[PDB]
Amino acid sequence: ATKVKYPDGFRSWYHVKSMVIQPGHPLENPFGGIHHVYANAEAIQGLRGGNYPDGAVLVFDLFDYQEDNHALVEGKRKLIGVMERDAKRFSATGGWGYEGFGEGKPDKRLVTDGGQGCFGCHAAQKESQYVFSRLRD
Amino acid sequence: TKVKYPDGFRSWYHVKSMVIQPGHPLENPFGGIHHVYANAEAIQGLRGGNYPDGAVLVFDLFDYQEDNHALVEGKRKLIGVMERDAKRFSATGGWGYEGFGEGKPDKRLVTDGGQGCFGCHAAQKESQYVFSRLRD
Ligand code: HEC
Ligand code: HEC
Ligand SMILES: [Zn+2]
Ligand SMILES: [Zn+2]
């Protein structure tokens, strides 16, 4: 394709982890909100300490939140980030293709530079195949 | 008579999450970052059917650490469990309530047959005693 596929049905995949990024954290833009990480079956193989098969997809699902009496509550989806494994097609950015969908909508693709900008930051995790998230129990 | 420990619950569908911080009314026992998981049968009730027997919902509660204005997940504090069985759990509206300390099967937390859990969940009689709603 050259392009990353919209990950249909990502919401029924394995929930890896969540984190909250609030105002004042260095990454308030653009990663401010509650985010959840999801992984398909092939991605779990790579997360477990296996290698990542082609077809492995990880999803960053980012929500705005609202403060409600000492509770942070999920608001609207801001975007999904998608990493799709293909050693051959996405060799230019380390075997992963990078894409963002605005509000998680399939038409609102965000990345304009082949994912160089995305890769630039993930290149730090060379040791773990460009993935920050770690599996927890 | 007892709620079964929900083996494999971490591979279930993630319904939603929420953060309860110090000061919230529910701070104990429920303070922390929590995620709600549902088995296949519980998804039927969530998308608007009746909840069939065998439906299980799970409240998975982690501590968090605040680090330069990020909330990072720490250790699992407990899980809350609702298990649907109209016959066995008639006394608590057809749901069995149980708490597992640290998410370990040995550490049962409920000592009043679920009455305490049931008293608050009863506000949501209209939606079969469930607070969580499905979101996209
Ligand atoms: C640093 C300045 C980043 C840039 C630019 C991008 N991402 Fe990244 N990403 C970053 C972090 C710190 C994390 C981990 C968050 C956590 O909760 O641990 C992530 C995570 C992802 C993931 C999930 C898988 C993983 O590597 O943990 C995906 C799918 C992802 N990011 C995609 C992505 C895309 C598409 C980006 C450009 C549009 C992008 N990221 C930029 C840090 C940084
Ligand atoms: C009053 C306040 C209570 C009490 C005493 C208990 N819970 Fe229940 N609970 C409450 C709320 C407001 C929520 C919703 C959280 C959210 O929207 O993110 C929940 C949720 C659960 C869930 C998830 C399913 C659901 O949304 O109904 C479970 C499985 C659950 N709670 C279990 C549970 C158990 C076992 C309790 C006694 C040990 C218990 N709860 C008490 C509010 C309240
Ligand atoms: Zn207050
Ligand atoms: Zn803070």
Residue numbers in the entry:
A (entry chain A): 2 to 138
B (entry chain B): 3 to 138
Quote what the paper states about this structure.
A widely applicable approach is the use of photocaged substrates, where the photocage is soaked into the crystal in advance and then activated using a laser pulse to provide uniform initiation of the reaction throughout the crystal. This work characterizes photocage release of nitric oxide and binding of this ligand to two heme protein systems, cytochrome c′-β and dye-decolourizing peroxidase B using a fixed target sample delivery system. In this work, we describe a thorough characterization of the application of the NO photocage N,N′-bis-(carb­oxy­methyl)-N,N′-di­nitroso-1,4-phenyl­enedi­amine (henceforth referred to as NO cage) to room-temperature microcrystals of two proteins: a gas binding cytochrome c′ (McCP-β) and a dye-decolourizing peroxidase B (DtpB). Laser parameters for photoactivation are systematically explored, and time-resolved structures over timescales ranging from 100 µs to 1.4 s using synchrotron and XFEL beamlines are described. We have demonstrated a sample and time efficient approach using fixed targets to carry out time-resolved SSX and SFX experiments with an NO photocage over the microsecond to second time regimes.
Prior to utilizing the NO cage to characterize NO binding, we sought to obtain suitable control structures including both the ground state of the proteins (ligand free) and a ‘dark’ structure where the NO cage compound had been soaked into crystals but not activated by the laser pulse. McCP-β occurs within the methano­trophic Methyl­ococcus capsulatus (Bath) together with a homologous cytochrome P460 enzyme that oxidizes hydroxyl­amine with NO as a reaction intermediate. Possible roles for McCP-β include NO buffering to mediate toxicity/stress or transport between different enzymes that interact with NO. Firstly, upon NO binding, a vacant coordination position on the distal face of the heme iron becomes occupied, resulting in unambiguous electron density changes.
